[PDB]
């Protein structure tokens, strides 16, 4: 079964950037309900109920037809979240081979910043936004609802393989930034683990 | 110009049902945001300004393709809030015209119910459950986003004249119920303002 995943530090190891009891209903509220509701969906499928959540999201067209949307939304919904917590973390840098990538691909920081800033405002209603490795060229994306650029472009409207993404479903800010996203898309650069990011790179690039 | 409409009730009103708190913030807030960002789109577009926005809605095929989609979601949800504030009162009896047409078309009442929780709750990420009308029988359908019924089938997925409605973005019931949507839904049933609902039926039928 999918179980809901530890969190790599404490409900607070954010602050003062991200509070934390969004965390804690976020990690203990929101992303349980994605375990459980994907597991009810898998019960009945052995050959994909104990893959890994991430390779599972690599095959939703092998389903049978009338999982596909449940599982998509909440096996997507399992992987977002379980790449998102990870995906976070005070003290780091962008620095090293990633920086430099990001610098060949987009000019500069500041404008990869800039992009992603936009992608992540202007996905209107529920979402995440990306950055993504689409072949070894990095890239912003953003994907609806619980949607992941592992899917596919025909089904999430984006590809590549995601180095780190933020999420942007109204729970994710409403309690701290009520419906102030850009500001919630500014403290994020406070937190996002750009150690993960480089781990995920290095083994991509 | 749009503005922020007037309720029928203080914030306290649909106490303890739906949280004033919820209910301020949703308004002075959300719904604000949704007229503002309207208003910008339409101030280079004097021919669609003077529009009532539930017009508007409906002819969002005419704008120039550049104003589609900004004015599709945020005149969506001026349209949509101003007919949700209207849609809410305690009090109120299903009865009459309306009662039996739910009747007729679904077969009981509770048949009914059943159908829009159903809807509301299999809405995956943001978006609105309806009750329409389409032209002689009631139906229950769900539109992501901001998108409305009255936008038609190509643009929403939906049709039909919105008789009530239920908001099922995360805003609307972050505060008191998390993510517990389902809990929403069942109190949406005591603050469904039945006489609106009617007087809306009677125009329409
Ligand atoms: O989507 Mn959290
Ligand atoms: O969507 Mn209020």
């Known amino acids: 079964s999918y179980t809901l995943p530890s969190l790599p530090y404490a409900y607070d190891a954010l602050e003062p950037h991200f509070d934390k009891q969004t965390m804690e209903i976020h990690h203990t509220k929101h992303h349980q ?11 009945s499928l052995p050959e ?12 939703l067209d092998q ?9 998509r939304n909440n096996a997507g919904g399992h992987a977002n979240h379980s790449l998102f917590w990870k995906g976070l973390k005070k003290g780091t840098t962008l620095q090293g081979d990633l920086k430099a990538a990001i610098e060949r691909d987009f000019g ?5 910043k800039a992009e992603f800033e936009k992608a992540a405002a202007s996905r ?14 990095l890239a912003v994306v953003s994907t609806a609802n619980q949607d992941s650029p592992l899917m596919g472009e025909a089904i999430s409207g984006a590809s590549g393989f995601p180095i ?3 999420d942007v479903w109204e729970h994710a800010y409403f309690l701290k930034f009520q419906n102030r996203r850009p500001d919630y898309i500014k403290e ?4 996002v683990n750009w ?5 995920r790179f290095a083994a991509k690039k």
């Open 33 to 43: 309900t994605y375990v459980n509701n994907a597991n009810a969906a898998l019960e």
């Open 48 to 59: 994909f109920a104990n893959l890994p959540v991430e390779e599972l999201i690599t095959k």
């Open 63 to 71: 389903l049978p037809a009338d999982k596909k949307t449940v599982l």
């Open 108 to 112: 500069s920081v500041d404008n990869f």
């Open 124 to 137: 209107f209603g529920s979402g995440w936004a990306w950055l993504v490795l689409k072949g070894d060229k």
């Open 164 to 166: 780190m993404g933020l």
């Open 188 to 191: 994020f650069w406070n937190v």
């Open 195 to 199: 150690d993960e990011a480089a781990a």
